[PDB]
Design an enzyme around this catalytic site. Sequence first.
Site, PDB file in Angstrom:
ATOM      1  N   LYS A  55      10.371  -1.753  -2.630  1.00 37.25           N
ATOM      2  CA  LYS A  55      10.160  -2.701  -1.499  1.00 37.25           C
ATOM      3  C   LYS A  55      11.170  -3.854  -1.599  1.00 37.25           C
ATOM      4  O   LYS A  55      11.922  -4.062  -0.625  1.00 37.25           O
ATOM      5  CB  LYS A  55       8.704  -3.181  -1.491  1.00 37.25           C
ATOM      6  CG  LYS A  55       8.451  -4.570  -0.919  1.00 37.25           C
ATOM      7  CD  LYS A  55       8.718  -4.704   0.560  1.00 37.25           C
ATOM      8  CE  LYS A  55       8.600  -6.140   1.023  1.00 37.25           C
ATOM      9  NZ  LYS A  55       8.185  -6.229   2.441  1.00 37.25           N
ATOM     10  N   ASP A  91       6.235  -1.381   2.678  1.00 37.04           N
ATOM     11  CA  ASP A  91       4.957  -1.805   2.051  1.00 37.04           C
ATOM     12  C   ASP A  91       3.849  -1.604   3.093  1.00 37.04           C
ATOM     13  O   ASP A  91       4.086  -0.839   4.049  1.00 37.04           O
ATOM     14  CB  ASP A  91       5.060  -3.234   1.502  1.00 37.04           C
ATOM     15  CG  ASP A  91       5.238  -4.314   2.556  1.00 37.04           C
ATOM     16  OD1 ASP A  91       5.095  -4.006   3.758  1.00 37.04           O
ATOM     17  OD2 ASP A  91       5.524  -5.464   2.163  1.00 37.04           O
TER      18      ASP A  91
HETATM   19  C1  8HA Z   1      12.156  -9.246   9.930  1.00 36.86           C
HETATM   20  O1  8HA Z   1      12.903  -8.344   9.157  1.00 36.86           O
HETATM   21  C2  8HA Z   1      12.328  -7.913   7.905  1.00 36.86           C
HETATM   22  C3  8HA Z   1      11.550  -8.769   7.145  1.00 36.86           C
HETATM   23  C4  8HA Z   1      11.009  -8.346   5.931  1.00 36.86           C
HETATM   24  N1  8HA Z   1      10.178  -9.338   5.227  1.00 36.86           N
HETATM   25  C5  8HA Z   1       8.970  -8.955   4.474  1.00 36.86           C
HETATM   26  O2  8HA Z   1       8.637  -7.817   4.368  1.00 36.86           O
HETATM   27  N2  8HA Z   1       8.182  -9.994   3.792  1.00 36.86           N
HETATM   28  C6  8HA Z   1       6.896  -9.800   3.014  1.00 36.86           C
HETATM   29  C7  8HA Z   1       5.743 -10.293   3.920  1.00 36.86           C
HETATM   30  C8  8HA Z   1       6.024 -11.558   4.706  1.00 36.86           C
HETATM   31  N3  8HA Z   1       4.977 -11.200   5.750  1.00 36.86           N
HETATM   32  C9  8HA Z   1       3.755 -11.753   5.818  1.00 36.86           C
HETATM   33  O3  8HA Z   1       3.317 -12.572   5.078  1.00 36.86           O
HETATM   34  N4  8HA Z   1       3.093 -11.230   6.854  1.00 36.86           N
HETATM   35  C10 8HA Z   1       3.904 -10.310   7.496  1.00 36.86           C
HETATM   36  C11 8HA Z   1       3.704  -9.472   8.643  1.00 36.86           C
HETATM   37 BR1  8HA Z   1       2.029  -9.508   9.604  1.00 36.86          BR
HETATM   38  C12 8HA Z   1       4.738  -8.615   9.074  1.00 36.86           C
HETATM   39  C13 8HA Z   1       5.945  -8.588   8.385  1.00 36.86           C
HETATM   40  C14 8HA Z   1       6.144  -9.412   7.259  1.00 36.86           C
HETATM   41  C15 8HA Z   1       5.092 -10.293   6.816  1.00 36.86           C
HETATM   42  C16 8HA Z   1       7.477 -11.917   4.977  1.00 36.86           C
HETATM   43  C17 8HA Z   1       8.432 -11.458   3.869  1.00 36.86           C
HETATM   44  C18 8HA Z   1      11.241  -7.032   5.467  1.00 36.86           C
HETATM   45  C19 8HA Z   1      12.028  -6.170   6.233  1.00 36.86           C
HETATM   46  C20 8HA Z   1      12.573  -6.594   7.436  1.00 36.86           C
HETATM   47  C21 8HA Z   1      13.425  -5.648   8.255  1.00 36.86           C
END
Ligand code: 8HA
Length: 313
Positions: A240, A259
Amino acid sequence: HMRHRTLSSSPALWASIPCPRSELRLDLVLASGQSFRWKEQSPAHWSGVLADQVWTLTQTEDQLYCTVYRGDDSQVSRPTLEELETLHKYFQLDVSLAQLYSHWASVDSHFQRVAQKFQGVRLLRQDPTECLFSFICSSNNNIARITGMVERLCQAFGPRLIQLDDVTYHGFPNLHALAGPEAETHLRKLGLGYRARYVRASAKAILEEQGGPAWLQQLRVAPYEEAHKALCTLPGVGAKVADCICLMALDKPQAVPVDVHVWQIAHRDYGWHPKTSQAPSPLANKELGNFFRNLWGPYAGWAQAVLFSADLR
Ligand SMILES: COc1cc(NC(=O)N2CCC(n3c(=O)[nH]c4c(Br)cccc43)CC2)ccc1C
Ligand code: NI
Protein backbone atom coordinates in the site's frame (compact mmCIF):
# COMPACT_ATOMS: atom_id res chain seq x y z
CA HIS A 1 5.65 41.06 11.22
CA MET A 2 4.94 39.34 7.81
CA ARG A 3 1.43 37.97 6.93
CA HIS A 4 -0.25 35.50 4.47
CA ARG A 5 -0.75 37.13 1.00
CA THR A 6 -4.04 37.32 -1.01
CA LEU A 7 -4.39 38.25 -4.75
CA SER A 8 -6.41 41.39 -3.68
CA SER A 9 -3.90 42.52 -0.93
CA SER A 10 -0.51 42.47 -2.81
CA PRO A 11 -1.15 41.57 -6.51
CA ALA A 12 2.34 43.04 -7.36
CA LEU A 13 4.10 39.94 -5.84
CA TRP A 14 1.99 37.30 -7.78
CA ALA A 15 2.70 35.45 -11.10
CA SER A 16 0.28 33.35 -13.28
CA ILE A 17 0.48 30.05 -15.29
CA PRO A 18 -2.05 29.39 -18.13
CA CYS A 19 -4.11 26.54 -16.51
CA PRO A 20 -7.84 25.76 -17.09
CA ARG A 21 -10.10 24.66 -14.14
CA SER A 22 -10.65 21.36 -16.10
CA GLU A 23 -6.86 20.55 -15.84
CA LEU A 24 -6.43 21.49 -12.10
CA ARG A 25 -8.71 22.22 -9.06
CA LEU A 26 -6.52 23.30 -6.05
CA ASP A 27 -9.44 22.65 -3.58
CA LEU A 28 -9.75 18.99 -4.85
CA VAL A 29 -5.98 18.13 -5.28
CA LEU A 30 -4.29 19.81 -2.22
CA ALA A 31 -6.79 18.09 0.20
CA SER A 32 -7.23 14.61 -1.48
CA GLY A 33 -4.64 12.98 0.89
CA GLN A 34 -1.69 13.33 -1.58
CA SER A 35 0.31 16.10 0.22
CA PHE A 36 -0.41 16.90 3.95
CA ARG A 37 1.49 20.27 3.83
CA TRP A 38 -1.15 22.64 2.23
CA LYS A 39 -3.76 24.62 4.28
CA GLU A 40 -6.46 27.09 3.00
CA GLN A 41 -5.24 29.87 5.41
CA SER A 42 -7.66 32.29 3.60
CA PRO A 43 -10.55 31.41 1.20
CA ALA A 44 -9.32 30.06 -2.22
CA HIS A 45 -5.68 30.72 -1.02
CA TRP A 46 -3.66 27.50 -0.33
CA SER A 47 -0.36 28.01 1.63
CA GLY A 48 2.28 25.21 1.90
CA VAL A 49 6.09 24.61 1.86
CA LEU A 50 7.70 23.24 -1.38
CA ALA A 51 11.48 22.44 -1.59
CA ASP A 52 12.69 24.71 1.32
CA GLN A 53 10.35 27.58 0.17
CA VAL A 54 6.74 28.62 1.15
CA TRP A 55 4.10 29.20 -1.62
CA THR A 56 0.51 30.58 -1.66
CA LEU A 57 -1.66 29.31 -4.61
CA THR A 58 -5.01 30.64 -6.03
CA GLN A 59 -6.71 30.28 -9.50
CA THR A 60 -9.42 31.71 -11.84
CA GLU A 61 -11.21 29.74 -14.66
CA ASP A 62 -8.11 29.73 -17.00
CA GLN A 63 -5.16 30.95 -14.78
CA LEU A 64 -3.14 29.56 -11.78
CA TYR A 65 -1.87 32.53 -9.64
CA CYS A 66 1.12 31.83 -7.27
CA THR A 67 3.44 33.89 -4.93
CA VAL A 68 6.72 32.87 -3.12
CA TYR A 69 8.15 33.68 0.38
CA ARG A 70 11.98 33.05 0.27
CA GLY A 71 12.28 33.95 4.01
CA ASP A 72 16.06 34.80 4.19
CA ASP A 73 15.17 38.50 4.99
CA SER A 74 15.35 39.00 1.14
CA GLN A 75 13.79 41.71 -1.14
CA VAL A 76 10.19 40.40 -1.77
CA SER A 77 9.46 39.86 -5.54
CA ARG A 78 7.33 37.73 -7.98
CA PRO A 79 8.16 34.05 -8.72
CA THR A 80 11.15 33.51 -11.13
CA LEU A 81 11.18 31.37 -14.36
CA GLU A 82 12.81 28.37 -12.52
CA GLU A 83 10.41 28.62 -9.49
CA LEU A 84 7.43 28.60 -11.98
CA GLU A 85 9.05 25.56 -13.77
CA THR A 86 9.20 23.87 -10.28
CA LEU A 87 5.39 24.49 -9.89
CA HIS A 88 4.71 23.23 -13.50
CA LYS A 89 6.60 19.92 -12.77
CA TYR A 90 4.87 19.66 -9.30
CA PHE A 91 1.35 19.67 -10.94
CA GLN A 92 2.67 17.68 -14.01
CA LEU A 93 0.74 20.14 -16.30
CA ASP A 94 2.66 18.82 -19.42
CA VAL A 95 0.21 15.81 -19.21
CA SER A 96 -3.33 16.52 -20.58
CA LEU A 97 -5.89 15.47 -17.87
CA ALA A 98 -8.85 16.17 -20.28
CA GLN A 99 -7.59 13.45 -22.74
CA LEU A 100 -6.99 10.95 -19.83
CA TYR A 101 -10.50 11.64 -18.35
CA SER A 102 -12.04 10.87 -21.82
CA HIS A 103 -9.82 7.71 -22.27
CA TRP A 104 -10.86 6.33 -18.80
CA ALA A 105 -14.56 7.30 -19.43
CA SER A 106 -14.68 5.31 -22.77
CA VAL A 107 -14.37 1.90 -20.90
CA ASP A 108 -15.88 2.99 -17.49
CA SER A 109 -19.52 4.26 -17.18
CA HIS A 110 -19.03 4.82 -13.37
CA PHE A 111 -15.98 7.15 -13.96
CA GLN A 112 -18.08 9.06 -16.61
CA ARG A 113 -20.72 9.93 -13.91
CA VAL A 114 -18.06 10.96 -11.27
CA ALA A 115 -15.96 12.86 -13.93
CA GLN A 116 -18.88 15.41 -14.21
CA LYS A 117 -18.53 17.23 -10.80
CA PHE A 118 -14.88 16.23 -9.96
CA GLN A 119 -12.74 17.65 -12.85
CA GLY A 120 -9.10 18.86 -12.47
CA VAL A 121 -8.08 16.04 -10.01
CA ARG A 122 -4.41 15.30 -11.01
CA LEU A 123 -1.43 13.64 -9.19
CA LEU A 124 1.24 15.89 -7.54
CA ARG A 125 4.94 15.07 -8.28
CA GLN A 126 6.27 15.01 -4.65
CA ASP A 127 9.78 14.73 -3.06
CA PRO A 128 10.36 10.96 -2.46
CA THR A 129 11.61 11.55 1.17
CA GLU A 130 8.60 13.76 2.18
CA CYS A 131 6.19 11.28 0.42
CA LEU A 132 7.83 8.14 1.99
CA PHE A 133 7.72 9.34 5.67
CA SER A 134 4.28 11.08 5.23
CA PHE A 135 2.77 7.71 4.04
CA ILE A 136 4.58 5.78 6.86
CA CYS A 137 2.48 8.13 9.13
CA SER A 138 -0.70 7.28 7.07
CA SER A 139 -1.12 3.64 8.36
CA ASN A 140 -4.56 3.25 10.11
CA ASN A 141 -4.88 7.11 10.22
CA ASN A 142 -7.12 9.97 8.87
CA ILE A 143 -5.97 13.03 6.76
CA ALA A 144 -6.34 15.46 9.75
CA ARG A 145 -4.24 13.27 12.17
CA ILE A 146 -1.54 12.61 9.45
CA THR A 147 -1.38 16.42 8.74
CA GLY A 148 -0.77 16.90 12.53
CA MET A 149 2.09 14.32 12.83
CA VAL A 150 3.87 15.63 9.64
CA GLU A 151 3.59 19.33 10.78
CA ARG A 152 5.01 18.49 14.29
CA LEU A 153 7.75 16.19 12.78
CA CYS A 154 8.87 19.09 10.46
CA GLN A 155 8.90 21.75 13.29
CA ALA A 156 10.99 19.38 15.55
CA PHE A 157 13.49 18.00 12.93
CA GLY A 158 13.22 20.25 9.80
CA PRO A 159 14.87 23.70 9.36
CA ARG A 160 12.67 26.84 9.97
CA LEU A 161 11.95 28.78 6.70
CA ILE A 162 9.61 31.73 7.65
CA GLN A 163 6.64 32.76 9.91
CA LEU A 164 3.38 34.03 8.26
CA ASP A 165 0.77 35.29 10.84
CA ASP A 166 0.61 32.56 13.61
CA VAL A 167 1.97 29.71 11.32
CA THR A 168 5.75 28.91 11.56
CA TYR A 169 6.87 27.04 8.36
CA HIS A 170 9.63 24.32 8.37
CA GLY A 171 11.12 22.43 5.36
CA PHE A 172 11.04 18.58 5.46
CA PRO A 173 14.04 17.15 7.41
CA ASN A 174 16.93 15.19 5.76
CA LEU A 175 17.38 11.42 6.49
CA HIS A 176 20.29 11.98 9.00
CA ALA A 177 18.04 14.16 11.28
CA LEU A 178 15.38 11.35 11.55
CA ALA A 179 18.03 8.56 12.08
CA GLY A 180 19.51 9.96 15.38
CA PRO A 181 19.44 7.90 18.64
CA GLU A 182 16.86 10.33 20.23
CA ALA A 183 14.64 10.38 17.06
CA GLU A 184 12.09 7.60 17.95
CA THR A 185 11.70 8.88 21.60
CA HIS A 186 11.08 12.50 20.34
CA LEU A 187 8.58 11.30 17.64
CA ARG A 188 6.54 9.26 20.24
CA LYS A 189 6.34 12.48 22.40
CA LEU A 190 4.92 14.19 19.21
CA GLY A 191 2.19 11.45 19.14
CA LEU A 192 3.21 9.19 16.16
CA GLY A 193 3.06 6.07 18.43
CA TYR A 194 4.23 2.79 16.74
CA ARG A 195 4.94 4.83 13.52
CA ALA A 196 7.84 6.61 15.38
CA ARG A 197 9.92 3.35 15.12
CA TYR A 198 9.29 2.90 11.32
CA VAL A 199 10.31 6.58 10.63
CA ARG A 200 13.70 6.24 12.48
CA ALA A 201 14.24 2.65 11.15
CA SER A 202 13.48 3.57 7.46
CA ALA A 203 15.67 6.76 7.71
CA LYS A 204 18.59 4.68 9.18
CA ALA A 205 17.98 1.92 6.52
CA ILE A 206 18.03 4.28 3.43
CA LEU A 207 21.32 5.80 4.82
CA GLU A 208 23.17 2.54 5.77
CA GLU A 209 21.53 -0.17 3.54
CA GLN A 210 20.75 1.93 0.38
CA GLY A 211 23.24 4.89 0.56
CA GLY A 212 21.06 8.01 1.12
CA PRO A 213 18.51 9.95 -1.01
CA ALA A 214 20.16 9.16 -4.43
CA TRP A 215 18.59 5.64 -4.00
CA LEU A 216 15.02 7.15 -4.13
CA GLN A 217 16.14 8.98 -7.36
CA GLN A 218 17.44 5.59 -8.73
CA LEU A 219 13.92 4.13 -8.01
CA ARG A 220 12.43 7.13 -9.99
CA VAL A 221 14.12 5.93 -13.28
CA ALA A 222 13.91 2.18 -12.31
CA PRO A 223 10.81 0.25 -13.57
CA TYR A 224 7.64 0.22 -11.34
CA GLU A 225 7.97 -3.39 -10.01
CA GLU A 226 11.75 -3.06 -9.19
CA ALA A 227 10.95 0.20 -7.26
CA HIS A 228 7.92 -1.39 -5.44
CA LYS A 229 9.97 -4.45 -4.24
CA ALA A 230 12.87 -2.12 -3.18
CA LEU A 231 10.55 0.09 -1.00
CA CYS A 232 8.94 -3.08 0.58
CA THR A 233 12.40 -3.88 2.18
CA LEU A 234 11.96 -0.74 4.43
CA PRO A 235 10.54 -0.89 8.01
CA GLY A 236 6.79 0.06 8.01
CA VAL A 237 6.55 0.11 4.14
CA GLY A 238 4.23 -2.55 2.59
CA ALA A 239 2.47 -2.88 -0.83
CA LYS A 240 0.00 0.00 0.00
CA VAL A 241 2.66 2.58 1.17
CA ALA A 242 5.11 1.37 -1.58
CA ASP A 243 2.40 1.90 -4.31
CA CYS A 244 1.58 5.40 -2.85
CA ILE A 245 5.29 6.48 -3.09
CA CYS A 246 5.54 4.86 -6.61
CA LEU A 247 2.41 6.79 -7.85
CA MET A 248 3.07 10.17 -6.12
CA ALA A 249 6.93 10.57 -6.10
CA LEU A 250 8.63 7.94 -8.40
CA ASP A 251 6.60 8.67 -11.63
CA LYS A 252 4.79 5.24 -11.74
CA PRO A 253 1.30 6.27 -13.01
CA GLN A 254 0.13 2.58 -13.27
CA ALA A 255 0.69 2.22 -9.44
CA VAL A 256 -2.77 1.53 -7.81
CA PRO A 257 -2.43 1.76 -3.96
CA VAL A 258 -4.84 -0.99 -2.65
CA ASP A 259 -6.23 -0.90 0.93
CA VAL A 260 -9.84 -0.99 2.38
CA HIS A 261 -10.65 2.36 0.57
CA VAL A 262 -10.34 1.07 -3.10
CA TRP A 263 -11.75 -2.35 -1.93
CA GLN A 264 -14.99 -0.53 -0.87
CA ILE A 265 -15.10 1.41 -4.23
CA ALA A 266 -14.12 -1.77 -6.22
CA HIS A 267 -16.96 -3.83 -4.58
CA ARG A 268 -19.78 -1.21 -4.27
CA ASP A 269 -19.18 0.74 -7.55
CA TYR A 270 -17.71 -2.03 -9.87
CA GLY A 271 -19.19 -5.23 -8.28
CA TRP A 272 -15.60 -6.65 -8.09
CA HIS A 273 -14.83 -9.85 -6.08
CA PRO A 274 -11.47 -11.73 -6.00
CA LYS A 275 -11.79 -14.29 -8.89
CA THR A 276 -8.46 -16.26 -8.67
CA SER A 277 -8.19 -15.90 -4.81
CA GLN A 278 -10.44 -17.81 -2.30
CA ALA A 279 -11.16 -15.51 0.73
CA PRO A 280 -8.72 -8.83 1.73
CA SER A 281 -5.17 -10.38 1.51
CA PRO A 282 -1.74 -9.63 -0.08
CA LEU A 283 -2.69 -11.91 -3.07
CA ALA A 284 -6.28 -10.48 -3.37
CA ASN A 285 -5.00 -6.83 -3.06
CA LYS A 286 -2.51 -7.48 -5.96
CA GLU A 287 -5.36 -8.95 -8.14
CA LEU A 288 -7.43 -5.74 -7.47
CA GLY A 289 -4.48 -3.53 -8.58
CA ASN A 290 -4.15 -5.64 -11.80
CA PHE A 291 -7.97 -5.35 -12.37
CA PHE A 292 -7.80 -1.48 -12.34
CA ARG A 293 -4.54 -1.45 -14.45
CA ASN A 294 -6.26 -3.83 -16.99
CA LEU A 295 -9.41 -1.55 -17.00
CA TRP A 296 -7.94 2.03 -16.96
CA GLY A 297 -4.47 1.30 -18.50
CA PRO A 298 -0.95 2.71 -17.79
CA TYR A 299 -2.32 5.81 -15.86
CA ALA A 300 -4.63 3.67 -13.60
CA GLY A 301 -3.21 5.41 -10.45
CA TRP A 302 -4.31 8.87 -11.76
CA ALA A 303 -7.89 7.52 -12.35
CA GLN A 304 -8.04 6.15 -8.72
CA ALA A 305 -7.21 9.69 -7.38
CA VAL A 306 -10.38 11.10 -9.12
CA LEU A 307 -12.65 8.44 -7.43
CA PHE A 308 -10.68 8.93 -4.12
CA SER A 309 -11.19 12.76 -4.29
CA ALA A 310 -14.91 12.00 -5.06
CA ASP A 311 -15.25 9.58 -2.04
CA LEU A 312 -13.53 12.10 0.37
CA ARG A 313 -15.67 15.14 -0.73
C1 8HA B 1 -6.13 11.04 -4.25
O1 8HA B 1 -5.15 10.18 -4.77
C2 8HA B 1 -4.70 9.10 -3.93
C3 8HA B 1 -4.61 9.26 -2.56
C4 8HA B 1 -4.16 8.21 -1.75
N1 8HA B 1 -4.13 8.49 -0.30
C5 8HA B 1 -4.47 7.47 0.70
O2 8HA B 1 -4.74 6.35 0.38
N2 8HA B 1 -4.42 7.81 2.13
C6 8HA B 1 -4.78 6.91 3.29
C7 8HA B 1 -6.17 7.35 3.79
C8 8HA B 1 -6.41 8.84 3.83
N3 8HA B 1 -7.92 8.65 3.75
C9 8HA B 1 -8.76 8.77 4.79
O3 8HA B 1 -8.45 9.01 5.91
N4 8HA B 1 -10.01 8.55 4.37
C10 8HA B 1 -10.00 8.30 3.01
C11 8HA B 1 -11.04 8.01 2.06
BR1 8HA B 1 -12.89 7.92 2.63
C12 8HA B 1 -10.72 7.79 0.71
C13 8HA B 1 -9.39 7.86 0.30
C14 8HA B 1 -8.37 8.15 1.22
C15 8HA B 1 -8.69 8.37 2.61
C16 8HA B 1 -5.57 9.72 2.93
C17 8HA B 1 -4.16 9.16 2.68
C18 8HA B 1 -3.80 6.97 -2.33
C19 8HA B 1 -3.88 6.82 -3.71
C20 8HA B 1 -4.32 7.86 -4.51
C21 8HA B 1 -4.41 7.67 -6.01
NI1 NI C 1 -20.75 -8.54 -3.38
